[PDB]
């Protein structure tokens, strides 16, 4: 038995020690002659070169440094196989390398003050808004880019402590209750907040300040 | 060619979504006859049971749902490939997966407080005490459990600023400095802190009391 295709999961920034060994190289030609081992593509003899190596007798696929996500996600390497004599005995074989996301950047809004406005009218349920934090990190297989956005404050607190939301993953901002009377309040400042890990990981803080407009 | 063995790295709390298709079995008996594939082990049919299986007529492994390192770090499962019979063509495959870790743990001080004394006449390089946070992520092959010591503030600053340091990775706080005297300042008020990922990462706080003795 054996899989169709296995590709290597390597997380960045890894410890080590390197070099780090993967997996291990096998011609089933072994018992026929002795084997001599070696790789090619990006990352191995074309740029970035030496990243990834081989030891040409035991067949073990080696990393020689830490690698990281952001730079290069993805390798496609080529494993080769050469009898004592010098014949190349079998087709290369595919190495895939998948660079899995480590939480290494922490989320930053666009802007540290937004602004906005919304009649002094309007119906619960208004979109006032959108903020937005953005994170280098990796939002589709992991959390790790993943936001959540949140309202930490609201300044002054009348009529009622809570006047605005903000939607947990798209950051629009919108009026949940009546009373606003510019007139008694016309502006209100919101502490906003942004944390990755989607809710779990590192938090970052902006502002946004919201105008209430006179309906004549 | 192909790999001697080839164990399987998955991510815990990855996002799906699930069941999470894995890598796919093959028997070369595949030409002459009907195969049908199962998996047995702690993960599959031992406790915990289903978080993986398998599709019994294409041989993809599957994860049915997010994993937790800290939970269980790694399992070893048998791979099965049966005729119609219902026995088996081939020996079974060892499967392993291996569960990398993310940095879902903040670190923590063993205490909020610790305390530690030192005589007045000692040189520079002295050990005085040693603090310690701890993090449930692994600090083996990632940097997310390996913890950064450093010292936030003194107080007082008498007679100078900087009289102790802390040992980056172990928490041992030493005196840098000389002139230490009891009768002039007899206690010391550091601000230490950890920060996880080698202090790329969450920071907390505590605090060293440091007793100058006569
Ligand atoms: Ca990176
Ligand atoms: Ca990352
Ligand atoms: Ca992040
Ligand atoms: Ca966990
Ligand atoms: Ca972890
Ligand atoms: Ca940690």
């Not at 390597?10 to 072994?30: I, T, Y």
């Not at 084997?35 to 990834?52: H, L, N, Q, R, W």
């Not at 081989?54 to 993805?74: C, F, M, Q, S």
């Not at 496609?76 to 895939?96: R, Y």
């Amino acid at each position: 038995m054996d899989w169709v295709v296995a590709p290597i999961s390597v997380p960045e920034n890894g410890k080590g020690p390197f070099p780090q060994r993967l997996n291990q190289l096998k011609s089933n030609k072994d018992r026929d002659t002795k084997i001599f081992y070696s790789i090619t593509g990006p990352g191995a003899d074309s740029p970035p070169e030496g990243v990834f190596a081989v030891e040409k007798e035991t067949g073990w696929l080696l990393l020689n440094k830490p690698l990281d996500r952001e730079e290069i996600a993805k390798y496609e390497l080529f494993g080769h196989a050469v009898s004592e004599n010098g014949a190349s005995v079998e087709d290369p074989m595919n190495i895939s390398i998948i660079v899995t996301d480590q939480n290494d950047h922490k989320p930053k809004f666009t802007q540290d003050t937004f602004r906005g406005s919304v009649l002094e009218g309007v119906l619960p349920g208004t979109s006032v808004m959108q903020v937005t934090a953005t994170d280098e990190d990796d939002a589709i297989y992991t959390y790790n880019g993943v936001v959540a956005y949140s309202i930490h404050s609201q300044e002054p607190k009348d009529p009622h402590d809570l006047m605005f939301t903000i939607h947990r993953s798209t950051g629009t901002i919108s009026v949940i209750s009546s009373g606003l009377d510019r007139e008694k309040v016309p502006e209100y400042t919101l502490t906003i907040q942004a944390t990755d890990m989607d809710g779990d990981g590192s938090t970052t803080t902006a502002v946004a300040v919201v105008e209430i407009l006179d309906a004549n």
